[PDB]
Amino acid sequence: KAHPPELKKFMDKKLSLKLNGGRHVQGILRGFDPFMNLVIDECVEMATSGQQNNIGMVVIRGNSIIMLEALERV
């Protein structure tokens, strides 16, 4: 019980994640947690109009995160 997600292959790789409310973020994964809460270093959130705003290193929770896709080779 309490198994962690297989995020070791995507650690330190630039990927794009989809957050709740129709949000899109893109950045390098700085780590993972047992509840899927990860750290995105140098994350840039893309707005619905098309502009992207860089928020730096932040923490993305897996409760509102829909799915992540790596932008590089796994």
């Binding site: 997600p5 297989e6 995507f10 790596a70 796994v74």
Partner: protein, 77 residues
């Protein structure tokens, strides 16, 4: 050890589709299947609810935002 989770873990490596709660349907080869239905695939095709389709080299969708999944007919026998 569930029967549906065991059938989802046994269906890894074949072509299957998964429709999420947001309407995005991703079809491809299930590379890794977790115990909580977290599916990591590679070279999948994702079609959104608006009709736009795209191809992803590698993705990993959690089971919390996943609605249903359709596997091949080889697992029925």
């Amino acid at each position: 050890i569930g029967v549906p989770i065991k059938v989802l873990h046994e269906a890894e490596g074949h072509i299957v589709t998964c429709e999420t709660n947001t309407g995005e349907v991703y079809r491809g080869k299930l590379i890794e299947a977790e115990d909580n239905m977290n599916c990591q695939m590679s070279n999948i095709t994702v079609t959104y609810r608006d009709g736009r389709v795209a191809q992803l080299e590698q993705v990993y969708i959690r089971g919390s935002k996943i609605r249903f999944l359709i596997l091949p007919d080889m697992l029925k026998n």
